[PDB]
Amino acid sequence: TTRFKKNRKKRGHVSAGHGRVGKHRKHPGGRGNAGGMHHHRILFDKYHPGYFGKVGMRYFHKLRNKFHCPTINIDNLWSLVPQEVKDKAKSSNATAPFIDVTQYGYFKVLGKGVLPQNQAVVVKAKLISKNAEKKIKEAGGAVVLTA
Amino acid sequence: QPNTGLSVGLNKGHVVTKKELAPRPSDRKGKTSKRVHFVRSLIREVAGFAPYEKRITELLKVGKDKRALKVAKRKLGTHKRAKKKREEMSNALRKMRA
Amino acid sequence: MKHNNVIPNGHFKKHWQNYVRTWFNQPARKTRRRAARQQKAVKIFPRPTAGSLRPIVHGQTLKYNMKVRAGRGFSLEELKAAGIPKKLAPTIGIAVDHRRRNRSLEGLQTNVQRLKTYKAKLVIFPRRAKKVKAGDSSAEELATATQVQGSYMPITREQPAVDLVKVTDEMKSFNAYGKLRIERTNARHIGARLKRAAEA
Amino acid sequence: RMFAPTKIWRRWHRKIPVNQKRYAVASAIAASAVPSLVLARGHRIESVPE
RNA sequence: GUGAAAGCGUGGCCUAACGAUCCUUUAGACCUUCGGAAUUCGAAGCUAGAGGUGUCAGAAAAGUUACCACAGGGAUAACU
RNA sequence: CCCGUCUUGAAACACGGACCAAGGAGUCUGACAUGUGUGCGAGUCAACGGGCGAGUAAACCCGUAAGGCGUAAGGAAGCUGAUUGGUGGGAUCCCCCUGAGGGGUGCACCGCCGACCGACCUUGAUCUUCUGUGAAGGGUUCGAGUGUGAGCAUACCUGUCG
RNA sequence: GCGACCCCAGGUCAGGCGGGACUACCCGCUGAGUUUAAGCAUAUCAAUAAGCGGAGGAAAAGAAACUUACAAGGAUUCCCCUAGUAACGGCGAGCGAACCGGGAACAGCCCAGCCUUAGAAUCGGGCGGCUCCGCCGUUCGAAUUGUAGUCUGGAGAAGCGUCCUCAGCGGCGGACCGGGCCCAAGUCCCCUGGAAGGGGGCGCCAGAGAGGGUGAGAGCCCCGUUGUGCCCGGACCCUGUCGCACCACGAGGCGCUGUCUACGAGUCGGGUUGUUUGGGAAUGCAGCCCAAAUCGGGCGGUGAAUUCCGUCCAAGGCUAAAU
Ligand SMILES: [K+]
Ligand SMILES: [K+]
Ligand SMILES: [K+]
Ligand SMILES: [K+]
Ligand SMILES: [K+]
Ligand SMILES: [K+]
Ligand SMILES: [K+]
Ligand SMILES: [K+]
Ligand SMILES: [K+]
Ligand SMILES: [K+]
Ligand SMILES: [K+]
Ligand SMILES: [K+]
Ligand SMILES: [K+]
Ligand SMILES: [K+]
Ligand SMILES: [K+]
Ligand SMILES: [K+]
Ligand SMILES: [K+]
Ligand SMILES: [Mg+2]
Ligand SMILES: [Mg+2]
Ligand SMILES: [Mg+2]
Ligand SMILES: [Mg+2]
Ligand SMILES: [Mg+2]
Ligand SMILES: [Mg+2]
Ligand SMILES: [Mg+2]
Ligand SMILES: [Mg+2]
């Protein structure tokens, strides 16, 4: 929106807001990231620590699909259960809901948060954390491994 | 070996009843006909051996198997092909001896 | 450069202004493709507009092996199991892929059942009107023949279901984390154990 | 040559959320039922039954 | 370590005597990786030093122009 | 004292300007960032594409286990993966009395100190496929973490950069 | 001296082919510097500009010596994403793909080699006919230093069964395209105006109030616009129907087999040099040197040896669409 640009307010003020002394020249400090070590060193060090140098090993032709591993938390396990399954589980204490997190797209189950109170859960997954397995067992459910 | 059904460890992966691949004509790419073998043997008889093949054979006759392998490697370019060529020269030498 | 900003890395140091591609022809391209589809449908009437039948295949890699999608064409082994000659399959709307290998039963059986369903749902007109051959359909079937606009055999996933099951003591006394850790350790140390066994 | 010559790859189009579009449509439909707003928009509806 | 002991000692009685990235090289682990699976060389990683930038917050650098050129400077010489 | 400009300093023996008309210079685009407006919200985004439709470059509709961003972080990596707080101030509200009063309530934010996850170190009962597990117990160490989410899309000004 | 063959020479011999032109896209080669790095040489600009060639309506690519490591995908091309990511980089400035996944479109094929030997079954020219983009007859020539036919790894040859499949013509329409002809309504009354097409009044058409012209803002003055109707010509392709003969020798499909099963060389690969690439003990390309193999060969993104495993089959060729 040109009519809201501040240069319109600066029409008739000579320097266009860039100063009489300093002026607005082409590239007073170089182009792009020039001088990262010499005259922009203070900026780079104070705002971009770690920028220079290299660490770790290289990995030629790295594909992310073999590292794909979505995770879900036990505090979010219950949200996957449909409402009808949920109230059926609430009504019946002799059985526990059986959640296959893989069908919803999760490989590993992490043990953050808590589960519903006095509810057993049978969770099937590819991987699980020790804390998550302990919490499920304490709740009275079970863990199943699948691939 | 069937998959264990686990996502880690040996023989990991989803459980399926593995099936042997059906035979296809491409299973014989490395093989040729008896006529081709006969023609190759006859042409070998007609044409003889190359100078480096003769050098390898002389080294094998002397008994310098390591030197023969080194010469074959320097000539052909790879250890695998050098081993194959040295073995073929050895077979030819055995046939000549018998 | 000044202030706390992300380090810029714009890739605009060549004559990029001469390689700009705009999309002002997007609606025109949509119209052209729709017109081509309509012309093809009119030409291939009464054959289905969705095209030839395709097999059901699994997604590649660990990220998508749980997904089912459409493959290029049915394998020779699938065609042989279904009883459809490979030279005849393309002429009756069945795609053929002579490269795909069958490694597991489940996929082959799924594709054979798919081919059987297609044959059950297929109607074939005779080459000559007055002559009826082995693979041709009856006059009653031919009369009520129409072009199918959409996908006649959708490849759909079995929707997830949460069921209530009894938790037995065997399941309650299973250490999933311990099992995973021990399997990882075995996979890591298989080589050393084999070396030691060979040595002794 | 003019300063900063105009170019075709100017951002001519806009991508408004569908929910906001539907909000605007619903608001316009609701306003169409108010006789005061219809008159205020310049329409002669003095003889409309209802 | 020393002293019987309290205690003192983390270099020189105190105030100067010194050095980033990248690379190389040395020391440490029954350490990690070489991505189809193993073993061994080789290579690559992690932690701590060393090889140096004295223009010492750290380019890799010889003159001449009276044959000369450009952007500027009265921020700066050669008159008054 | 003649304007404009650079300048510590201009009416200057400082430079431009004989006069008039018309033209004449912070723009468009990409990546970010703060702020503000709007929609939805642990989600958000249909415009790659498809179905159509003002006989139509608009508008409308469509997300299958699509994808992007967010929803988990720490390690070079192998790999592991958040036990769910306390306390001092503090807004608002409710009671007793009308003192700069007492009691209850204690959101936002700030200060201080624990706990949990991970890199490193340290530690070790019981099981175990003998190299894994982890009852108990830790640390002047390290993190762009956790302790009942706050993002996604879009509009504009401003700022850095190509 | 004659004859046969070989190689070559001359023909204004009979009949054909080629050169050059255009630039937006396309294919091959060659190839900078300005510039950025606040200097500058590697780098960047850029596998770009300039220069030299070659096509079409598209070109190029194309049917795995592929991607992957999965529960596996399956020619080529293009879009979204992957991703400003892996990687490359005085690891500085900067640079920077690919696979999976979702879409557009989809299509597969032809050769060389062992296999007629009861006869080259093949092809070109002249001449003469015919329903003339071709077919038939005759005669010369090409070709055995190999034209036809079968075969192409997905297979296939050969043998035995199954009796499952395979043979044109002509007419009338539809579909596509390009054109031609006709078809609504005021120029009524008053005023100002040089001129109403302006103002006021009274009427009308409208599946036509897009636009233009005519003496000033014109739906009804004119051309046109909307929607019917009729007429003409191409494309011989697709499609429906109708009329007649519809011959399975042979060739395909399916099942079996104690038999065979032929697959591209100064090419692959290796060393080295130069260049290029994200390709990093070396991504591709090219020069020179070495130089293969058939229970084998290429690839599996860290060089090397050993043992396995996975996946394909190069060094010959054609091919519409998405762009
Ligand atoms: K300013
Ligand atoms: K100023
Ligand atoms: K590395
Ligand atoms: K900023
Ligand atoms: K001391
Ligand atoms: K300096
Ligand atoms: K000089
Ligand atoms: K000035
Ligand atoms: K002046
Ligand atoms: K999403
Ligand atoms: K570490
Ligand atoms: K002839
Ligand atoms: K042939
Ligand atoms: K062959
Ligand atoms: K081949
Ligand atoms: K070479
Ligand atoms: K192989
Ligand atoms: Mg040092
Ligand atoms: Mg998804
Ligand atoms: Mg082409
Ligand atoms: Mg991203
Ligand atoms: Mg794809
Ligand atoms: Mg002839
Ligand atoms: Mg006039
Ligand atoms: Mg008219």
- Cβ neighbours of residue C119 closer than 8 Å, sequence gap 6 or more: C82, C84
Distance CA A104, CA A147 (A): 14
CA nearest neighbour of C104 among B27, B8, B14, B4 = B14
Q: Tokens 């109170």, residue?
A: A117
Q: Is A35 left (phi over 0), alpha (psi -120 to 50) or beta?
A: left
- Cβ neighbours of residue A71 closer than 8 Å, sequence gap 6 or more: A106, A107, A108, A109, A110
C-beta atoms of C102 and B8 within 8 A: no
User: How close D3 comes to chain C (CA, Å)?
Assistant: 17
Q: H-helix or E-strand containing B73? A: helix B65-76
First CA to last CA distance, chain C:
68
Are C73 and C55 within 8 A, CB to CB? Answer: yes
Distance CA A109, CA A130 (A): 10
**Method used to determine the 3D structure:** cryo-EM
Q: How far is the CA of A44 from the centre of ligand 1 (A)?
A: 24
Please give all residues whose CB falls under 5 A of ion ligand 4, grouped by chain where several chains appear.
C 3, 5
C-beta atoms of A127 and B7 within 8 A: yes
CA nearest neighbour of C57 among C116, C117, C90, C97 = C97
Q: For D9, name the nearest residue in chain C, comparing CA atoms only.
A: C22
Q: How far is the CA of A37 from the C1' of E22 (A)?
A: 13
Please report residues contacting nucleic strand E, using a CB cutoff of 7 A.
Answer: A 37-38, 41, 52-61, 66; C 187, 190-192, 194-195
- Cβ neighbours of residue B15 closer than 8 Å, sequence gap 6 or more: A147, B2, B3, B4, B5
Are A122 and A96 within 8 A, CB to CB? Answer: yes
Tokens standing for A142? 């079970």
Tokens standing for D43? 């329409």
Distance CA C2, CA A32 (A): 11
Tokens standing for A141? 């459910």
Are A44 and A59 within 8 A, CB to CB? Answer: no
User: How close B84 comes to chain C (CA, Å)?
Assistant: 28
| Alpha helices, H only, chain D | 18-32, 35-40
Q: For A108, name the nearest residue in chain B, comparing CA atoms only.
A: B7
Interface of C with A in 139-178 (CB under 8 A): 160, 162-167, 171-172, 174-177
* Resolution (Å units): 2.2
Option in C8, C64, C176 nearest A143 (CB): C176
Q: Is the peptide bond before C48 cis (omega within 30 degrees of 0)?
A: no
The contact set of D with C (CB < 8 A) is 8-9
C-beta atoms of A122 and C167 within 8 A: yes
